[PDB]
RNA sequence: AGUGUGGAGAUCGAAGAUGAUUAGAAACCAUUGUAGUCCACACUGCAAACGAUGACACCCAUGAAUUGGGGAUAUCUUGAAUAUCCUCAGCACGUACGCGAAAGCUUUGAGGUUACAGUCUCAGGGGGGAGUACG
RNA sequence: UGCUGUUGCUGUUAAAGGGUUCGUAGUUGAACUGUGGGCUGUGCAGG
């Protein structure tokens, strides 16, 4: 049973927040993973384990082995999240990484290569994400090319909802902890790029907590 | 020494836009710099700008709105036939939906879309988006 | 922020509160200055110290008071003081405006450790000196919380949004400015009136 | 400064934007040209002539009053230096350096500076030969 | 791996080329004068008890007239400075602390 | 300290060895010539 | 509380700048009246009337006992 | 405002806040971007229902230039007087 | 860093020609020393006559007698 | 450092001598000492010859300093110096973007680069063999 | 295989800036000669 501990969790439980778009718009952090389970419909948040590998810390008698788990979450329709957690046992790491992945969900802007008919199918502009030595570059592609990418970025992009994209990589891509995060940062950056379609000014609106301050007072 | 006035000006503009300034001083100026600025202005990427006369190569103060992501010069000014526009857009522009390659042509300095409409080639000056 | 939509000067400085600013030494500026506070300084005096012009000081005080008054729930505004000379002024401001408060050492994780109890999620933060209240300001920058600060001349203005140039060290100056902020905020509400001078006496606003 | 060394000094004149002579300057252009020629006839190069006119006679710029630069006036009157002024001064410096090095054969720093001065002399002589301000076969003799 | 931004010496990249060495006060090792550890020592000639005994026997020295001191500028090589504990290895964060006056 | 692990002996003495080797080879060939 | 305009700077900012760092460069020097002669403020060529001024590294020093008036432009 | 098909549908997932000071899009994970509500004052000192809200991008906060930007905003919006 | 001039083609051509020799594979492909030293003379296979059967000990940490022939 | 020819030859000191230490000690330590160390003239052209960071040019945040020259307007000696501010040029220091595998760098870039183009130039392409062999 | 790199590499510590200058082919090289004007209609032009 979920008993919220933050104001945003209380507003989500009270149903006065109906989408993740409202949280994204005001840049509010998500501290309880149940918010994402609530705001995304049943059976529409796909998860997957991306990589599990051991890490060792040397000790005066041998070494201590823990496990790092990387989890991807997404609705295949413009929302993606990456979680990475360490645990003494594999199952603990997997569960914690699923929760962390749900916590780190982000919007992905999708666009068109040429003519704008149908749903957006590709990224709206060239983007690059870097983590360590690994950099992943996403290039818009026409319809029908699919995801021309290595398997790990391919899986992440599939969970993000991108159908056609050219991809280039550099650095030590076998460092998969860095590759996953580099792809995530490339995707997260699609909504920060100012396009002529976003030149028109916006009316600033009050935050959910501002408008439901009295409700959260009780 | 300074070898390209246009490259210097466009690097200055890109630095000022990257650091969030609203005005930038350009020095020295030339006719080609003014035409490039006017091409950027025609598409709304910069605001109003003023040419200061010093009886020398002048100075320009450009008013920057937040629309300009990056502008830069292409050196050397490569030849571009009418069939090379797609290649340059693929190579140097963020997408086919926006952004411009600026060219100098015998019909004058213009962006790539207007040049393709006039069916003229020329030398590539730079880009902005 | 004395300008209003109607053009009235109801919120301008009445010269009946200015001599209080001059009286409690609210302009002496620690002989040190920062780039962000170059604007609020009028000049350098004898003995090598800076003075804060009172026009901009009062304008920012009005802006902060109006921002505080825009909050429907006074408990949504937390006011903090790591320095000991602000604790009593903090208590008095809170007990007269309804704002939350906390003095002394700031416990890290207060605004970010959700599951720890004593974890609070204020909407606005008011601090007495951004240098000494640095930890609260650092925590606020992780949770979308704007910061109002009483800033001296050498104030690091990193995550402060409304800086009030003042004297951050004198007991009398801190008490005077907090009393002024409380009075102005209560005047923006209907609780007191402009014509009648406030009954509250400011000597007990000082610490110990 | 920049040529031959790490000097990056910026000191120089800043000519005024308003080019018209001051109203209190009541010397006619022909008299200024006469002054320039008289100074040249007393063995003064254009730099020194301009400096005397600026210091003692209130003539900030000869070109702004007469419309002509000082070396142009000297050329029109047959008074221009046989070899250009800057080249003359560089050759004089090189000659003095060589005279000093005749006795001081271990002043290696002066030998270095002499190499720099002679390279400068050759680059300038090349320029002046190209613009026909020097004869062909003009030779710098050490 | 560069341990120090100054490379253990007071000689910035474009300040000067060569600084003439000096002999270590202790071992004689030649050390660039900028790099060496320099201390100026003002030392009493006798300790307090010897000073009292000598002042008791002196018409010159007493409460009115101080006894002379020793003055020495001592420059050490790094090994001798460390060994005599005039300077010690410090934690990485504390290595940047510089004292300009005697304390 | 002040250096990383060499492949064999101290490089300056290895260079001195190769120097003595070259001098000996030069002497040998000047003998045969 | 006023944003500076690069095209129209304040006199306080422009007064501080080096003569070639100004928005439009220009001289620091002037002419002065000291018969009455005209002397450059930065004369170095031993101006005479008796010497009227002494050359230095910057502005020449006018000799004591003679009156000096700065000229326009 | 945003992307559209040829059919006229708005296909952007959401329209992010564009800061009035920096003219940059506020990201979902900015977490230092803030919104400040500055109250409107009537003929007298009493506060009415309506309020003015302004957004500051998080990087502007991180660089210590947020107070300056809010000053210029309140000068532009008529909230705060430019001079005496 | 590299030269960029519009008429600087000769410098780039000479530079690439010189530096192509540093690639070990390219150098082996464009020289005769490997083909000369190669017992097969550049062929994929070669016929030979068995001289003797020999046993070659495997390298550490393995331990075996690898059966070979001298041909 | 080394080479040649003259000179010098106090000090220190490769070679060497003697005494210790040691299992041995051709070492470290002690006492010495040749060549050298110094000068003129002529060679040699190698250094962790280092900022292990090529040269020229542009932009670039903050505070306290420092060297030289200028500009404007409190103290001390009798012009010099000092004070406040500004300025050009120089060697740097502390705490912003941004960058980097990190250590770190940061108007003194290693920043302004996959959003990859100011100019010229040198070098590198797994470790050894080897800066060896041959010319 | 962006491990030959024009597109498109690396050179503080991983391989790699020449000890420092001078300098000839070579490469590269600052501005400037230049807003065409009137007339009617038409356009979320704008102050
Ligand atoms: Mg050292
Ligand atoms: Mg020097
Ligand atoms: Mg050296
Ligand atoms: Mg030292
Ligand atoms: Mg060690
Ligand atoms: Mg070490
Ligand atoms: Mg090494
Ligand atoms: Mg020798
Ligand atoms: Mg001797
Ligand atoms: Mg001896
Ligand atoms: Mg031993
Ligand atoms: Mg001995
Ligand atoms: Mg190799
Ligand atoms: Mg490589
Ligand atoms: Mg290197
Ligand atoms: Mg390196
Ligand atoms: Mg190396
Ligand atoms: Mg050499
Ligand atoms: Mg040269
Ligand atoms: Na085995
Ligand atoms: Na070094």
Curated annotation (Swiss-Prot), chain C:
GO biological process, one term: ribosomal small subunit assembly
Disulfide-bond pairs as recorded: none
Transmembrane segments: none
Keyword Kinase: no
GO molecular function: structural constituent of ribosome
Superkingdom of the source species: Eukaryota
Subcellular location: Cytoplasm
GO CC annotation terms, alphabetical: cytoplasm; cytosolic small ribosomal subunit
Entry's family note: Belongs to the universal ribosomal protein uS2 family.
Quaternary context: Component of the small ribosomal subunit. Mature ribosomes consist of a small (40S) and a large (60S) subunit. The 40S subunit contains about 33 different proteins and 1 molecule of RNA (18S). The 60S subunit contains about 49 different proteins and 3 molecules of RNA (25S, 5.8S and 5S). Interacts with ribosomal protein S21.
Protein name: Small ribosomal subunit protein uS2
The organism of origin for this protein: Leishmania major
Source species taxonomy: Eukaryota, Discoba, Euglenozoa, Kinetoplastea, Metakinetoplastina
Span of the entire protein shown here: 1 to 208 of 246
């Amino acid at each position: 049973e979920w008993v919220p501990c933050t104001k945003l969790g209380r507003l989500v439980k009270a149903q006065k927040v109906t989408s993740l778009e409202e949280i994204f718009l005001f840049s509010m952090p998500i501290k309880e993973h149940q918010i994402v389970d609530t705001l995304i419909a049943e059976g529409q948040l796909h998860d997957e384990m991306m990589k599990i590998y051991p890490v060792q810390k040397a000790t005066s008698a041998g070494q201590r082995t823990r496990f790092k788990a990387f989890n991807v979450v997404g609705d295949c329709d413009g929302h993606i999240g990456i979680g990475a957690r360490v645990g003494k046992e594999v199952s603990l790491a997997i569960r914690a990484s699923m929760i962390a992945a749900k916590l780190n969900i982000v919007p992905v802007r999708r666009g068109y290569w040429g003519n704008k008919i149908g749903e957006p199918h590709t990224i709206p502009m060239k983007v690059t994400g870097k983590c360590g030595s690994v950099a992943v570059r996403l290039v818009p592609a026409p319809r029908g090319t699919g995801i021309v990418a290595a398997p790990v970025p391919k899986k992440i992009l599939e969970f993000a909802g991108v159908e056609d994209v050219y991809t280039s990589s550099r650095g030590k891509t076998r460092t998969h902890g860095n590759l996953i995060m580099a792809t995530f940062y490339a995707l997260r950056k699609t909504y920060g790029f100012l396009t002529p379609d976003l030149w028109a000014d916006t009316e600033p609106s009050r935050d959910p907590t501002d408008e439901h301050a009295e409700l959260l007072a009780e | 020494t300074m070898m390209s006035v246009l490259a210097n000006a466009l690097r200055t503009i890109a630095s000022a836009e990257r650091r969030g300034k609203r005005q930038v001083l350009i020095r020295p100026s030339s006719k080609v710099v003014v035409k490039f600025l006017q091409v950027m202005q025609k598409h709304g990427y910069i605001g109003e700008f003023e040419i200061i006369d010093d009886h020398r190569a002048g100075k320009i103060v450009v008013n920057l709105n937040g629309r300009l992501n990056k502008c830069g010069a292409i050196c050397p000014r490569f030849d571009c036939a009418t069939t090379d526009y797609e290649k340059w857009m693929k190579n140097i522009l963020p997408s086919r939906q926006f952004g411009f390659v600026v060219l100098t042509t015998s019909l004058g300095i213009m962006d790539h879309e207007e040049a393709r409409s006039r069916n003229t080639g020329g030398k590539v000056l730079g880009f902005f988006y | 922020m004395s300008a209003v939509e109607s053009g009235s000067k109801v919120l301008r400085m009445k010269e009946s509160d200015a001599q209080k600013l001059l009286a409690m030494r609210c302009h002496i500026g620690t002989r040190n200055q920062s780039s962000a506070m170059k604007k609020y300084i009028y000049g350098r005096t004898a003995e090598g110290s800076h003075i804060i012009d009172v026009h901009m000081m009062w304008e920012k005080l009005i802006l902060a008071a109006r921002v505080i008054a825009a909050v429907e729930n006074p408990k949504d505004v937390c006011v903090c003081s790591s320095r000991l000379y602000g604790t009593r002024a903090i208590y008095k401001f809170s007990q007269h405006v309804g704002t939350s408060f906390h003095g002394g050492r700031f416990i890290p994780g207060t605004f970010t450790n959700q599951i720890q109890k004593k974890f609070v999620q204020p909407r606005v933060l008011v601090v007495t000196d951004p240098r000494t209240d640095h930890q609260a300001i650092r925590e606020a920058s992780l949770v979308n919380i704007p910061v109002i600060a009483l800033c001296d001349t050498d104030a690091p203005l990193e995550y402060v949004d409304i800086a009030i140039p003042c004297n951050n060290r004198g007991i009398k100056s801190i008490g005077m400015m907090y009393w002024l902020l409380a009075r102005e905020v209560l005047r923006l509400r209907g609780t007191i009136v402009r014509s009648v001078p406030w009954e509250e006496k400011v000597d007990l606003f000082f610490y110990r | 400064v920049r040529m031959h060394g790490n000097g990056r000094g910026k000191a120089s004149s800043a000519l005024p934007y308003r080019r018209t002579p001051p109203a209190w300057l009541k010397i006619a252009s022909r008299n200024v040209v006469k002054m320039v020629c008289k100074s040249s006839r007393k063995g003064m190069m254009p730099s020194q002539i301009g400096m005397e006119l600026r210091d003692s006679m209130g003539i900030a710029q000869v070109k702004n009053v007469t419309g002509r630069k000082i070396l142009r006036i000297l050329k029109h009157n047959g008074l221009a230096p046989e070899i250009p002024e800057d080249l003359y001064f560089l050759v004089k410096r090189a000659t003095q350096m060589r005279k000093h090095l005749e006795r001081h054969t271990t002043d290696r720093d002066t030998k270095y500076r002499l190499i720099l001065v002679e390279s400068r002399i050759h680059r300038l002589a090349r320029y002046y030969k190209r613009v026909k301000q020097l004869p062909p076969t003009w030779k710098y003799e050490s | 791996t560069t341990k120090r931004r100054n490379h253990g010496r007071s000689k910035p990249a474009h300040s000067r080329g060569r600084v003439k060495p000096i002999h270590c006060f202790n071992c004689g090792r030649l050390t660039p004068k900028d790099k060496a550890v320099g201390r100026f020592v003002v030392r009493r000639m006798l300790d307090a008890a010897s000073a009292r005994d000598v002042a008791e026997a002196s018409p010159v020295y007493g409460a009115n007239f101080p006894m002379p001191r020793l003055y020495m500028k001592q420059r050490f090589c790094i090994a001798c400075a460390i060994h005599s504990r005039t300077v010690r290895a410090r934690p990485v964060g504390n290595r940047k602390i510089r004292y300009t006056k005697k304390v | 300290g002040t250096v990383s692990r060499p492949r064999g002996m101290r490089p300056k003495w290895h260079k001195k060895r190769i120097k003595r080797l070259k001098l000996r080879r030069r002497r040998m060939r000047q003998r045969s010539k | 509380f006023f944003d500076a305009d690069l095209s129209y700077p304040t006199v306080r900012t422009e007064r501080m700048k080096h003569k070639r760092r100004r928005l439009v460069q220009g001289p620091n020097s002037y002419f002065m009246d000291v018969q009455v002669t005209v002397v450059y403020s930065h004369a170095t060529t031993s101006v005479e009337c008796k010497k009227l001024c002494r050359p230095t590294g910057g502005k020449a020093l006018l000799v004591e006992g003679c009156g000096y008036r700065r000229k326009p432009d | 405002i945003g992307m559209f098909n040829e059919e006229g549908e708005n296909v952007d997932l959401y329209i992010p806040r564009k800061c009035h000071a920096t003219t940059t899009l506020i990201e979902a994970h900015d977490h230092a971007a803030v919104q400040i509500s500055i109250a409107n004052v009537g003929p007298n000192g009493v506060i009415n229902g309506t309020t003015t809200t302004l957004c500051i991008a998080g990087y502007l906060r991180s660089q210590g230039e947020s107070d300056h930007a809010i000053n210029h905003i309140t000068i532009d919006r008529g909230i705060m007087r430019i001079k005496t | 860093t590299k030269t960029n001039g519009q008429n600087a083609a000769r410098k780039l051509v000479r530079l690439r020609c010189r530096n192509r020799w540093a690639d070990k594979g390219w150098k082996r492909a464009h020289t005769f020393s490997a083909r000369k030293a190669n017992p097969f003379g550049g062929s994929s296979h070669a016929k030979g006559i068995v001289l003797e059967k020999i046993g070659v000990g495997a390298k550490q940490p393995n331990s075996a007698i690898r059966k070979c022939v001298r041909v």
